[PDB]
């Protein structure tokens, strides 16, 4: 073995307590981070029992390999000299180059970034692709800024970051505040400085190093994940009454893939009210919703002028409808206890998380004690992160795979992500728990590699 | 002709309030930093009145150009894999490469470093030499570590830092926890990695790129500063009674230079009690105190077991004895409002700060309203930082100046530091206030250069 | 068309003699190297006759493009400052980046390394993949060192080497003294220094850039090579009585693949004595031998306690038993003269070398004059080097091929290696001599490319 | 010993003709360049006679070592995407790093730049300091652009140039369109990109790496040059009546130094009309003219108001006045054949060129055939280029010399520049011709070094 501290007798629980204490004291004022930490810490008790080493390893991995913060100055259109704070947390590079998006939001700060970046490590880990974990951004607020100002900012932001990122070092991506438009400016500036065309950013337009399936990526992934849980029960998606919530990017393509398979997608939520449609939606109808939602930027009720057999319930959730599968694709905690009882009552057999952690901490308890399969968002929606890894591959190969090819790869990646949760949770809990499986599997790949590499 | 934000009608005081508010909100949990900031902010009101631009410029300068934080792993002697957090804050490089020491202390963290680094910017600025401001360190605790472990740590620490420092970029130095022994290890490792002998660190041993007068540097400087205040009063140091506090490195050489001039140094403090010596100390006696204090490493009370003629009180500094020139070399707010009076009463004509801010905030008030010259530590002890700038010069010239030569340079640097405080405070306050002079002068050189360079 | 010397009317033999003389005088005290040279020189006479140029080209190629030697210091566990000599001979980069393992052995020195590296050039050449030739190591003795010390050494060793290796420059690998554990430490350190995840080393663990089939690689290759020699005789491996020698990594997987095909593998040698098994081994039995050998770590007589029919032969060579194919896999000069005779007597129509040069120089004579196909180890076991080339490919593509895929690629690479020996020996000797074919083909690809590139 | 260009038996004149023909054909459409070339070519006939080699060497030196041209994009204040062409001609680096200013003018193009850069080679050469020759700029028109736009442009311009310049490679400087304001922005941007404070540009403000005497540099130099011509005639400047042409930067400091010596400066020209002042100007009066001319930004005619005695002419060259010394510091063709005949008729003794080539080609003929000493502008005003070389030195030493020190150095440099013209012209023409001396000396140092370095 090795020695990463924690050699005492201390009940595995006391060591876990000692660690928590030590991590908290060093990061007193980083709530968001400390919370995402105490979270990963919970499900990792089984592995700690197998070997103490992991407790020390975790303490180490919880400490960003490196974090760069810098002043990003820019001149707005009124000729004013503004300033913002930029960050890039290169959390872990054990499995590959630091991977992680950039967030431009007024709420952004070190604590927030560490939180996001820390979680990225393991999410990436599951991918199977060689990707480390990272995250960056600024407290810059895109809202209200002109097109020109956004450009000026991106250029300045990249002028600082450019020297610390690279194809084999750190490959950033889009996130809140940083979309396609932004990635174009960032890339342009990077190319001008470094003087070379290379995959430093993922989510590039298709005309210059982008990948196919980037848009549909996450949604398709969620379905593929579920399709795998089902195939391991001699069943498939064909003819399953599905509940979907949200009408965002993920939600849309999720429905598109679902329809294309066995169909019977009954609903689609909105920031206020949802839509019903007995007999399920159809290819054609989804296009309308996509149009209305993308182009027409209209409320979801709108669909009502398009359907004969539609029905819009307002300020309510679709959870009291009987279904086989349910896809929480809106936002965090959209599923409380009352919703568990509702599901456990309509006999619902499975819930695949689309958005990040759409289930409430106490809601998972009832669901598990009622034998209702729960798919971790950490694994189910990793489809997006996975495709960006493929973008990196295509960039290195100097080729672009067909919409067809890229999809197939995503399907195998999803299949693998499933197998790992399944097998890992089985081996460590004796039962098949996807949620714990995702955490253990994700952590172990990193922890072991960390050890094999000398503990650097 | 530049627009940096505060163009409104608002009272200079309201703008200063708006700024304070904005800086605090972004650095909520960095007490040490926020305090050193609100401090520099105070004395800068006169300049704000001359031009609003400076308020914006200050907001910008208060934001580290860049800050790098990284995990420093190492294996102790028991074969344990330990870990520590390392920092390097490259605060400002407007006047030259980032300059600033490295501190190894269990209390070290980003807030503490920003605090030290932020102050370094202006202290360096006064120097006249081309030096930016920076600071670094780790929460690593030297105390208790073996010789071997200290080496292992330094090597690891440098392996991370090495890529971000350089002769023309960032030149670190010693500080608490990082002494000569440490700088040797750091340098050795740097050389091995970068594959080149160059001045990346100051405070190097004399055998390999070190400078003469490095030890005496600060103390000599404090005397030279005072000698300049006096010469501008048709008087000199010859035959003046002195109340020197402390017996550290600074204190010692301060006395040595004093004696060598006009002499009549009456005291030398200790962590508990001080020593008297009517008719002043003598070259010979100082050597004893130096011996007793440096090598033997035994409580200064031991001087009593040496020459008879000297007493030794207890639990207090010699702030009572009737002196005309006070040199406090110890620690933070070493002197307060109570001692402050003993001085007004006995009547100390002038007080030259040796340690950092040895005067209490309220003590300065009474002293100034009693026409007692007070020398800012920021300027008086800059002698140390100045000599390290000369080490850099000698390194670039590939030569080593004689103990003689290096001294003369230090004397002119001290003379210049004095003139700037004198002239600046005169021009902006109409009177000759050394304390405000130091702040204004230090800030202005940076602020202007900042503007001239495009506000980057 | 290009003049590299040796133009006189002199006999091809006198030029070969002149060259030998010149190479020896410059490398007087490098026996191992001079021997491996005089060896490659022998079989290259036919090509020399076709064009003198090649004699000069060889003189050039025999001179390492560059060789770096360096002092590697480290602190053992008793706190002692030790030191060792490290080497990296970048012999040739005409066909690709320098490729070649690292050997940690007390016998290591420049002569030894050149010897190994020089041979690597041509071995790699045959591969078909773009790989130059190199070799490195230290006189460091792993034996007796603690786990911790091995780590400390690797880190120091890499700190020196790191600046001269890279994905497109020199990609080292494992060898004697440098196994998986070591490559992990080396990689870890490299990543920390260069600050980037890239394929600098092959033989990495599967969790971080490793490849599938790495273990089985060499063994599978030897079988694939033989399978190709057979297919060019309208026959295959199915039902062939075979003789294997050794129970190492190569031997094991060789048997595994053999069994899987037509089977009838009759023996497996050991450092003292061999095992028999009429009717051949079976999938199951091999697993036992693998277990007994890789885990239990005991002599081979042990297999007896696992098979009634299995006869053991204390201290001998299997050769006398009648077989169709003999795969020697022990060590240099494993097949003596008297042995070789029995192969001809026993009808044995072919001998595929598994270990490096397991046949004695004079043994090859009788075997060839008796029409017994002899496969050059240089080509037959190149399977290992080939797979490491695929690891490099996968690393560049940022993907990991399936155990399945990687195998197929290896099969084509082996097929190609065979075809080149076959066709080349045919074209230059009029007959099909695999041994000469391997040398000529391997040399020519390098020699020509050398010329085409300007003779640099 | 070394065979370069020509040795064809041809007449020195036919070879010079062959060369001219060859240089012209390769640069058909670069009038400005071809003219500055045919010019240097003329005075170099004496040296060609001494050795043919130089003819070939010249052909080589006339070919820019390297020239980089690039598109410089920027966004004006109306939000428009503009574009301009940037250049950097690194003409010669035989004597040191490429040195040369940057010009921002609507007329700028490759031809223009080569012209200026080509001449810079030799001008620098005479300096004695280690400086190669270069030149750069853009067709960007500062006139009409806002402060903000100028900044945006500089930043973009530097973003392209930054990778090709450096302290030991190419050190640009100011010129038409590129003043102090611009060099600040250029420097700021460079520092941000390269991440290091170093002397990449000369003409930096004094607060950050600038040098003393930068303003007065050229003017002072012209006087020092003349003072040297006089001392070699047992005479000095004391009490000499002289005329200056112009009131620019050069003209002003020229007068300032003149006054300070022996004085009796009688005039100062303007873009239309000049000023007289019998008994010469005085320290005080010059300050008025300096004030009136710099800040007030008026025409020289407004001086008539600050002095009764001073009369004033309009659009009339100040050459028909009897004197001793003259100094044309305005612009080209300042002295026509006409204006030349006045000089001889006023028994004028010597003429020191201040501006670049203020004498007309045919005017030099009459002046020389009348024994009137003519100082080449190439040498007389090299004072400016010389001081910038000292800025480089001070930057490397990390110190700033006093106004005093820097002056002295300039005086020796001027003295040396004089001696070389004197001695060289003597050795090659048997007589003391400063104009030919400057050319020959300047060219020879470069030509020889070129040869000694291998002809690269």
Say if the Cβ atoms of D192 and A159 lie within 8 Å.
yes
Say if the Cβ atoms of C207 and A396 lie within 8 Å.
no
Q: How far apart are CA A389 and CA B251, in angstroms?
A: 62
Is C120 annotated as a binding-site member? yes
Alpha carbon of B344: minimum distance to chain D alpha carbons (Å): 40
Phi, psi (deg, nearest 5) at residue D296: -55, -25
Distances (CA, A) of C138 to A183, A408, C112, C147, C176: 48, 47, 11, 17, 11
Is the distance from CB of C194 to CB of C161 less than 8 angstroms?
no
CB-CB: which of B66, B81, B456 is closest to A455? B81
In this structure, the strands spanning D66-75 and C312-313 are unpaired
Alpha carbon of B309: minimum distance to chain D alpha carbons (Å): 48
Q: How far apart are CA B120 and CA B133, in angstroms?
A: 5
Residue A271 CB neighbours (<10 A): 11
Phi, psi (deg, nearest 5) at residue A172: -65, 175
Residue C288 CB neighbours (<10 A): 17
Token pair 């100045």 is at which residue? Answer: B386
Chain B neighbors of C195, CB-CB under 8 A? 163
Report CA A64 to chain centroid distance, whole Å.
Answer: 19
The answer to whether chain D touches chain B by having 3 or more C-beta pairs less than 8 angstroms apart is yes
Say if the Cβ atoms of B81 and A64 lie within 8 Å.
no
Report CA D155 to chain centroid distance, whole Å.
Answer: 27
CB-CB: which of B169, B389, B445 is closest to D195? B169
User: Which segments of A174-225 are extended strands (E)?
Assistant: none
Assigned token pair, C82? 């030790």
Give the helix, strand, coil percentages of chain A, each rounded to 5: 50, 15, 35
Check D135, D145, D240, D445 and give the catalytic one.
Answer: D135
Among B110, B160, B156, which residue's Cα sits nearest to residue B135? Answer: B110
Say if the Cβ atoms of C75 and B148 lie within 8 Å.
yes
Phi, psi (deg, nearest 5) at residue D148: -60, -45
In this structure, the strands spanning B81-92 and B132-138 are antiparallel
Say if the Cβ atoms of A453 and C185 lie within 8 Å.
yes
Q: In what order do the strands lie in the sheet with D350-352?
A: D274-275, D265-269, D242-245, D325-328, D350-352, D373-375
Report CA A349 to chain centroid distance, whole Å.
Answer: 24
Say if the Cβ atoms of D77 and A79 lie within 8 Å.
yes
Q: Give Cβ neighbours of residue D244 (< 8 Å, ≥ 6 apart).
A: D251, D254, D255, D258, D265, D267, D268, D269, D326, D327, D329, D354
Is C96 annotated as a binding-site member? no
What Å resolution does this PDB entry report? 3.1
Chain D positions touching chain B (beta carbons under 8 Å) = 147, 151, 154-155, 184-185, 187-189, 191-192, 195-198, 205, 207-209, 396-400
Chain A neighbors of B85, CB-CB under 8 A? 26, 63
Assigned token pair, C161? 């080497």
Chain B neighbors of D205, CB-CB under 8 A? 449, 452
Chain D neighbors of B168, CB-CB under 8 A? 196-198
Assigned token pair, B141? 């605790």
Among A193, A132, A205, which residue's Cα sits nearest to residue A157? Answer: A193
Q: How far apart are CA B385 and CA B408, in angstroms?
A: 15
Chain C positions touching chain B (beta carbons under 8 Å) = 75, 77, 79, 148, 151-152, 159, 163, 192-193, 195
Q: Give Cβ neighbours of residue B427 (< 8 Å, ≥ 6 apart).
A: none
Say if the Cβ atoms of D79 and A148 lie within 8 Å.
yes
Distances (CA, A) of B342 to A279, B320, B346: 93, 6, 6
Say if the Cβ atoms of A81 and B4 lie within 8 Å.
yes
Alpha carbon of A153: minimum distance to chain D alpha carbons (Å): 13
Q: Which residues pair with C374 in a beta bridge?
A: C351
Is C437 annotated as a binding-site member? no
Distances (CA, A) of D217 to C399, D124, D256, D398, D403: 64, 15, 12, 21, 11
Is B146 annotated as a binding-site member? no
The answer to whether chain D touches chain C by having 3 or more C-beta pairs less than 8 angstroms apart is no
Q: How far apart are CA C4 and CA C382, in angstroms?
A: 31
Assigned token pair, C155? 């880190």
Assigned token pair, A195? 């003087």
Say if the Cβ atoms of D159 and A195 lie within 8 Å.
no
Q: Which residues pair with C151 in a beta bridge?
A: none
Chain B positions touching chain C (beta carbons under 8 Å) = 75, 77, 79, 148, 159-160, 163, 192-193, 195
Report the chain A residue with the minimal C-alpha distance to residue D159: A193
Distances (CA, A) of D346 to B335, C185, D341: 79, 88, 9
Report CA D250 to chain centroid distance, whole Å.
Answer: 11
Chain A neighbors of C155, CB-CB under 8 A? 454
Token pair 């009593």 is at which residue? Answer: B304
In this structure, the strands spanning C132-138 and C98-104 are parallel
Q: Which residues precede chain breaks (C–N over 2.5 Å) in chain B?
A: none
C194 is catalytic: no
Say if the Cβ atoms of B453 and D187 lie within 8 Å.
yes
Domain boundaries, chain B: 1-208+433-456, 209-432
Report the chain D residue with the minimal C-alpha distance to residue A189: D159
Q: Decide which of 3.40.190.10, 3.10.180.10, 3.30.1230.10, 3.40.50.720 is the CATH code for C209-432.
A: 3.40.50.720
Is the distance from CB of B311 to CB of B344 less than 8 angstroms?
no
Residue A360 CB neighbours (<10 A): 16
The three-state DSSP-derived secondary structure of chain D is CCCCCCCCCCCHHHHHHHHHHHHHHHCCCCHHHHHHHHHHHHHCHHHHHHCCHHHHHHHHHCCCCEEEEEEEEEECCCCCEEEEEEEEEEEECCCCCEEEEEEECCCCCHHHHHHHHHHHHHHHHHCCCCCEEEEEEECCCCCCCCHHHHHHHHHHHHHHHHHHCECCCEEEECECCECHHHHHHHHHHHHHHHCCCCCCCECCCCCCCCCCCCCCHHHHHHHHHHHHHHHCCCCCCCCCCEEEECCCHHHHHHHHHHHHHCCCEEEEECCCCEECCCCCCCHHHHHHHHHHHHCCCCCHHHHHHCCCCCCCCCCCCCCCCCCCEEEECCCCCCECHHHHHHHHHCCCCEEECCCCCCECCCHHHHHHCCCCEEECHHHHCCHHHHHHHHHHHHHHHCCCCCHHHHHHHHHHHHHHHHHHHHHHHHHHHCCCCHHHHHHHHHHHHHHHHHHHCCCC
- Kindly report the length of chain A: 456
Say if the Cβ atoms of B159 and C79 lie within 8 Å.
no
If DSSP codes are grouped into helix, strand and coil, which group holds residue A325? strand
- A413 by Cβ neighbours in 10 Å (0-12 / 13-18 / 19+) ranks as buried
Q: How far apart are CA A160 and CA A172, in angstroms?
A: 14
Distances (CA, A) of C232 to C226, C264, C422: 10, 21, 10
Assigned token pair, A290? 């996509």
Pick among A27, A60, A63 to test the B interface (most B CBs inside 10 A): A63
- Kindly report the length of chain B: 456
Pick among A19, A27, A58, A71 to test the B interface (most B CBs inside 10 A): A71
In this structure, the strands spanning C373-375 and C350-352 are parallel
Is D437 annotated as a binding-site member? no
Is the distance from CB of D195 to CB of B456 less than 8 angstroms?
no
Say if the Cβ atoms of C209 and A130 lie within 8 Å.
yes
Q: How far apart are CA B444 and CA B424, in angstroms?
A: 10
Query: First CA to last CA across chain B, in angstroms?
Result: 17
Q: Which chains touch B (3 or more CB pairs under 8 A)?
A: A, C, D
Distances (CA, A) of B316 to A293, B245, B362: 77, 10, 19
Check C135, C152, C293, C445 and give the catalytic one.
Answer: C135
Report the chain A residue with the minimal C-alpha distance to residue B80: A3
Experimental method: X-ray
Token pair 């060889």 is at which residue? Answer: C58
CB-CB: which of B79, B148, B192 is closest to C159? B192
Assigned token pair, D197? 């404070």
Is the distance from CB of D268 to CB of D247 less than 8 angstroms?
yes
Chain A neighbors of C207, CB-CB under 8 A? 95, 445, 448-449, 452
Q: Give Cβ neighbours of residue C296 (< 8 Å, ≥ 6 apart).
A: C302
Q: How far apart are CA B132 and CA B453, in angstroms?
A: 14
Is the distance from CB of C40 to CB of C57 less than 8 angstroms?
no
In this structure, the strands spanning D170-173 and D242-245 are unpaired
Tell me the Ramachandran region of residue C144: left when phi exceeds 0, alpha when psi lies from -120 to 50, beta otherwise: left
Alpha carbon of C414: minimum distance to chain A alpha carbons (Å): 25
Q: How far apart are CA B124 and CA C115, in angstroms?
A: 58
Q: Which chains touch A (3 or more CB pairs under 8 A)?
A: B, C, D
Q: How far apart are CA D179 and CA B448, in angstroms?
A: 17
Residue A107 CB neighbours (<10 A): 11
If DSSP codes are grouped into helix, strand and coil, which group holds residue A351? strand
Token pair 């690194």 is at which residue? Answer: D90
Q: Which residues pair with A104 in a beta bridge?
A: A138
Is the distance from CB of A32 to CB of A59 less than 8 angstroms?
no
Is the distance from CB of C86 to CB of C136 less than 8 angstroms?
yes
Say if the Cβ atoms of B453 and D207 lie within 8 Å.
no
Chain D neighbors of B129, CB-CB under 8 A? 398-399
Q: In what order do the strands lie in the sheet with A268-269?
A: A268-269, A274-276, A311-313
Q: Give the DSSP per-residue string, C41-106.
A: HHHTHHHHHH-THHHHHHHHHTS-SEEEEEEEEEE-TTS-EEEEEEEEEEEE-SSSSEEEEEEE-T
């Amino acid at each position: 073995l090795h020695n990463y501290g924690y050699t005492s007798t201390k009940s595995v629980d006391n060591q876990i307590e000692e660690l928590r204490e030590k991590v908290v004291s060093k990061n007193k004022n980083e709530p968001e981070f400390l919370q995402a930490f105490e979270e990963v810490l919970s499900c990792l008790k089984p592995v700690f029992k197998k070997d103490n080493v992991y407790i020390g390893v975790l303490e180490n991995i919880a400490e960003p390999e490196r974090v760069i913060q810098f002043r990003v100055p820019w001149i707005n259109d009124k000729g004013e000299h503004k300033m913002n704070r930029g960050f890039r947390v290169q959390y872990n590079s054990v499995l590959g180059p630091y991977k992680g998006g950039l967030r431009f939001h007024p709420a952004v700060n070190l604590s927030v970034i560490k939180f996001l970046g820390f979680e990225q490590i393991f999410k990436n880990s599951l991918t199977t692709l060689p990707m480390g974990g990272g995250k960056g951004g600024s407290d810059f607020d895109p809202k209200g800024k002109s097109e020109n100002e956004i450009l000026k900012f991106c250029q300045s932001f990249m002028t600082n970051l450019f020297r610390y990122i690279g194809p084999n070092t750190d490959v950033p991506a889009g996130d809140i505040g940083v979309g396609g438009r932004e990635i174009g400016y960032l890339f342009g500036q990077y190319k001008k400085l470094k003087n070379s065309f290379e995959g430093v950013l993922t989510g590039k337009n298709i005309k210059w190093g982008g990948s196919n399936i980037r848009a549909e990526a996450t949604g398709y992934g969620v379905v593929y994940f579920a399709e795998n849980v089902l195939k391991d029960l001699n069943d498939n998606l064909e003819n399953k009454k599905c509940l979907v919530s949200g009408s965002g990017n993920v939600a849309q393509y999720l429905v598109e893939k679902l329809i294309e398979k066995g169909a019977i997608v009954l609903t689609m939520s909105d920031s206020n009210g949802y839509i019903l449609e007995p007999n399920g939606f159809t290819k054609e109808q989804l296009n309308y919703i996509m149009d209305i939602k993308n182009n027409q930027r209209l409320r979801l009720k709108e669909y009502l002028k398009y359907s004969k057999t539609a029905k819009y319930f307002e300020n309510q959730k679709p959870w009291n409808i009987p279904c086989d599968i349910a896809f929480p694709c809106a936002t965090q905690n959209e599923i409380n206890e009352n919703d568990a009882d509702l599901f456990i009552q309509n006999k619902c057999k499975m819930i695949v998380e689309g958005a990040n952690m759409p289930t409430h901490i106490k809601a998972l308890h009832k669901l598990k004690q009622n034998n209702i399969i729960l798919c971790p968002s950490k694994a189910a929606n990793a489809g997006g992160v996975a495709v960006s890894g493929l973008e990196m591959s295509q960039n290195s190969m100097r080729l672009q795979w067909t919409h067809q090819e890229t999809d197939m790869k995503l399907q195998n990646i999803m299949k693998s992500i499933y197998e790992q949760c399944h097998n890992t949770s089985k081996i460590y809990l004796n039962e098949s728990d996807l949620v714990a499986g995702a955490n253990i599997a994700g952590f172990l790949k990193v922890a072991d590699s960390f050890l094999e590499q000398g503990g650097l």
